Design a protein around this ligand. Structure first.
Ligand code: MTX
Length: 386
């Protein structure tokens, strides 16, 4: 385990996210292999995934820490394999509903890897291993996107062949996850430990940052895709560049050392203000010069969030007394997706404050603005008390 414990963990994190046929699921559904109407792929496939992400997250984060994270990784891998198998068969609508349910299972179990890395190493190099793991995962996502687009656009393969390749890669990822090691009123004690951990000043700040900034980033990304498709070839290039910059920034965050608990609220406020500025710049671009300045901006935005994705996790592991690193990650992810759903309902739904995409992004930038003057006014409040 001297050389094949963190290196192997990063390698598995890289290989588990290689699904070259991931981003091409919708065209495959709408393609000639499966005769699906535009209306169904969007009204019977996306809502089920959206709801099941909320539904299946709770059991996953409740049981991942007791299961010691190897069974949850195996479940995520087998669920990815079942997703692609169901994609290959795809007999009817219910098959694809089950596929989306399993995909939501995978997205819910994504937290098990981020807890496994911390439960696998001594509580001294949490930050370095967090940076390594996030760099590996984001590099895997970037490689998956680039491989899919290279095979489809500059290569010559069908969607079925791409899905076969993705299924083979997912089988290999399951094989890799098999060899991973397993670290060596229960609910009442669980919640008591969660509350006592939340009483700490370092877990609480980064948990709030997760719940809010992660929700903001997810909203911004999920609607940046739609905004770019609204106002084609370079879209995947921008996505891959953003993911690669995210991997680089996660590596840098793993390798950065600053005196935390003092320059931590200030760092969060600065990063959130930078992200707010980037989103404001992204929204305020209607001139023809909207293929260089905005794309890159979004890239930076993604990287910015990733620059705080391995630190926050690390700052949750360094401030946890029990083996509840998975519980806090799961609760934070669940609350972040709850906040994202609430924001979507309040800004995107017609019944609520229904606004178009432009004003939607004007709201998201302002949402980050309220999220960058709260942490700004949190680094001087505690400074005053000193
Ligand atoms: C939503 N989606 C891909 C996706 C695309 N089209 C689809 N189309 C259909 N019909 N169904 C789907 N389930 C579907 N899924 C996703 C979701 C999350 C990440 C993801 O992994 N996101 C993190 C990366 C970190 C990680 O790997 O967990 C991020 O920074 O955005 C990638 C693609």
């Amino acid at each position: 385990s001297w050389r094949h414990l963190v290196c192997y963990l990063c390698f598995y994190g890289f290989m588990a996210q290689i699904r070259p046929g991931e981003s091409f699921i919708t065209p495959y559904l709408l393609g000639p292999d499966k005769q699906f109407t535009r209306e169904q792929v969007t009204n019977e496939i996306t809502p089920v995934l959206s709801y099941s992400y909320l539904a299946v997250l709770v059991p996953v984060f409740l049981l991942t820490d007791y299961l010691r994270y190897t069974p949850v990784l195996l479940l995520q891998g087998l669920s990815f394999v079942s997703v692609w198998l169901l994609l290959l068969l795809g007999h009817s609508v219910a098959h694809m509903q089950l596929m989306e349910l399993f995909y939501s299972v995978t997205m819910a179990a994504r937290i098990a890897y981020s807890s496994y890395i911390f439960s696998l190493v001594r509580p001294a190099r949490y930050q370095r291993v967090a940076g390594y793991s996030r760099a590996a995962v984001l590099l895997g996502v970037f490689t998956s996107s680039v491989l899919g687009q290279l095979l489809v656009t500059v290569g010559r393969v069908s969607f079925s062949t791409l899905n076969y390749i993705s299924l083979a890669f997912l089988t290999f990822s399951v094989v890799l996850a098999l060899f991973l090691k397993r670290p060596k009123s229960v609910l009442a004690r669980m919640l008591r430990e969660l509350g006592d951990s939340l009483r700490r000043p370092q877990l609480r700040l980064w948990s709030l940052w997760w719940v809010f900034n992660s929700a903001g980033y997810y909203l911004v990304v999920y609607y940046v895709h739609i905004l770019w498709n609204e106002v084609r070839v370079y879209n995947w290039a921008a996505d891959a560049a953003s993911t690669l910059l995210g991997a680089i920034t996660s590596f840098a965050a793993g390798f950065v050392k600053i005196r935390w608990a003092r320059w931590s609220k200030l760092l969060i406020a600065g990063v959130t203000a930078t992200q707010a500025g980037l989103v404001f710049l992204l929204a305020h671009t209607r001139h023809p010069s909207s293929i260089w300045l905005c794309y890159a901006a979004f890239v930076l935005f993604r990287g910015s969030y990733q620059f705080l994705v391995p630190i926050a996790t690390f700052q949750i592991a360094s401030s946890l007394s029990k083996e509840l690193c998975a519980l806090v990650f799961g609760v934070n992810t669940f609350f972040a997706t709850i906040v994202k759903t609430i924001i979507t309902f309040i800004v995107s739904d017609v019944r609520g404050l229904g606004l178009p995409v432009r004003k939607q992004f004007q709201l998201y930038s302002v949402y980050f603005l309220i999220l960058s003057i709260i942490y700004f006014l949190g680094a001087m409040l505690d400074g005053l008390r000193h």
